[PDB]
Protein backbone atom coordinates (compact mmCIF):
# COMPACT_ATOMS: atom_id res chain seq x y z
CA UNK A 1 0.00 0.00 0.00
CA UNK A 2 1.98 2.69 1.47
CA UNK A 3 4.62 2.23 -1.80
CA UNK A 4 1.97 2.49 -4.14
CA UNK A 5 -1.55 4.35 -5.29
CA UNK A 6 -4.28 1.40 -4.34
CA UNK A 7 -5.37 1.32 -7.73
CA UNK A 8 -2.47 -0.39 -8.33
CA UNK A 9 -2.71 -2.01 -5.08
CA UNK A 10 -6.15 -3.34 -5.61
CA UNK A 11 -4.09 -5.21 -8.57
CA UNK A 12 -1.75 -6.67 -6.37
CA UNK A 13 -3.41 -7.38 -3.32
CA UNK A 14 -5.31 -9.76 -5.27
CA UNK A 15 -1.79 -12.25 -6.26
CA UNK A 16 -1.82 -12.03 -2.44
CA UNK A 17 -5.29 -13.23 -1.56
CA UNK A 18 -5.04 -14.95 -4.56
CA UNK A 19 -2.34 -16.82 -2.96
CA UNK A 20 -3.28 -16.70 0.49
CA UNK A 21 -6.83 -17.65 -0.20
CA UNK A 22 -5.22 -20.79 -1.97
CA UNK A 23 -2.56 -21.82 0.55
CA UNK A 24 -5.73 -22.16 2.69
CA UNK A 25 -7.75 -24.16 0.66
CA UNK A 26 -4.89 -26.37 -0.05
CA UNK A 27 -4.70 -26.61 4.43
CA UNK A 28 -8.44 -26.80 4.62
CA UNK A 29 -8.74 -29.57 2.17
CA UNK A 30 -5.88 -31.03 3.69
CA UNK A 31 -7.13 -31.39 7.04
CA UNK A 32 -10.50 -32.57 5.71
CA UNK A 33 -8.69 -35.49 4.32
CA UNK A 34 -6.78 -36.00 7.59
CA UNK A 35 -9.92 -35.07 9.50
CA UNK A 36 -11.35 -38.66 7.64
CA UNK A 37 -8.09 -40.55 8.63
CA UNK A 38 -8.56 -40.05 11.97
CA UNK A 39 -12.36 -40.47 11.60
CA UNK A 40 -11.50 -44.02 10.34
CA UNK A 41 -9.14 -44.48 13.19
CA UNK A 42 -11.42 -42.92 15.82
CA UNK A 43 -14.27 -45.25 14.35
CA UNK A 44 -11.80 -48.28 15.30
CA UNK A 45 -10.94 -46.75 19.04
CA UNK A 46 -15.15 -47.07 19.24
CA UNK A 47 -14.33 -50.73 17.74
CA UNK A 48 -12.42 -51.83 19.82
CA UNK A 49 -13.29 -50.05 23.08
CA UNK B 1 -30.97 4.46 -17.14
CA UNK B 2 -29.72 7.98 -16.31
CA UNK B 3 -26.53 9.31 -17.81
CA UNK B 4 -24.48 12.17 -15.88
CA UNK B 5 -22.70 14.48 -19.05
CA UNK B 6 -20.00 16.63 -17.39
CA UNK B 7 -17.47 18.81 -19.24
CA UNK B 8 -14.91 21.09 -18.78
CA UNK B 9 -11.22 22.69 -19.77
CA UNK B 10 -7.94 21.51 -19.06
CA UNK B 11 -4.24 21.53 -19.82
CA UNK B 12 -2.96 19.25 -23.04
CA UNK B 13 -0.50 17.76 -20.49
CA UNK B 14 -2.65 17.11 -17.25
CA UNK B 15 -5.64 15.18 -19.73
CA UNK B 16 -3.77 11.60 -18.39
CA UNK B 17 -4.29 12.32 -15.21
CA UNK B 18 -8.02 11.81 -16.05
CA UNK B 19 -8.22 8.14 -15.92
CA UNK B 20 -9.81 6.44 -13.74
CA UNK B 21 -7.83 5.56 -10.05
CA UNK B 22 -4.68 8.07 -10.99
CA UNK B 23 -3.44 11.13 -9.49
CA UNK B 24 -2.17 14.53 -10.45
CA UNK B 25 -3.32 17.76 -9.79
CA UNK B 26 -6.75 17.64 -11.69
CA UNK B 27 -7.57 14.01 -10.22
CA UNK B 28 -6.08 15.18 -6.79
CA UNK B 29 -7.93 18.61 -6.02
CA UNK B 30 -10.22 19.29 -8.66
CA UNK B 31 -12.32 16.35 -10.82
CA UNK B 32 -12.25 12.71 -9.76
CA UNK B 33 -13.18 9.62 -11.50
CA UNK B 34 -14.48 7.26 -8.84
CA UNK B 35 -13.00 3.93 -8.43
CA UNK B 36 -15.14 1.71 -9.85
CA UNK B 37 -16.15 3.20 -13.08
CA UNK B 38 -18.29 2.94 -16.59
CA UNK B 39 -18.01 5.95 -18.83
CA UNK B 40 -16.20 7.47 -21.77
CA UNK B 41 -13.26 9.93 -21.47
CA UNK B 42 -14.03 12.24 -24.68
CA UNK B 43 -10.92 14.60 -25.43
CA UNK B 44 -9.50 17.16 -27.91
CA UNK B 45 -8.21 20.28 -28.48
CA UNK B 46 -9.74 23.75 -28.72
CA UNK B 47 -6.75 25.54 -29.11
CA UNK B 48 -8.65 27.80 -32.26
CA UNK B 49 -11.26 28.79 -30.01
Not at chain 1, 26 to 49: D, F, P
Not at chain 2, 10 to 24: F, S
Not at chain 2, 36 to 47: K, L, R
Request: proline share 2%; glycine share 6%; net charge neutral.
Amino acid sequence: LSRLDKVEAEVQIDRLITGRLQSLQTYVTQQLIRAAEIRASANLAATKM
Amino acid sequence: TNVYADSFVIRGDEVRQIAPGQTGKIADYNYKLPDDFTGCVIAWNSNNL
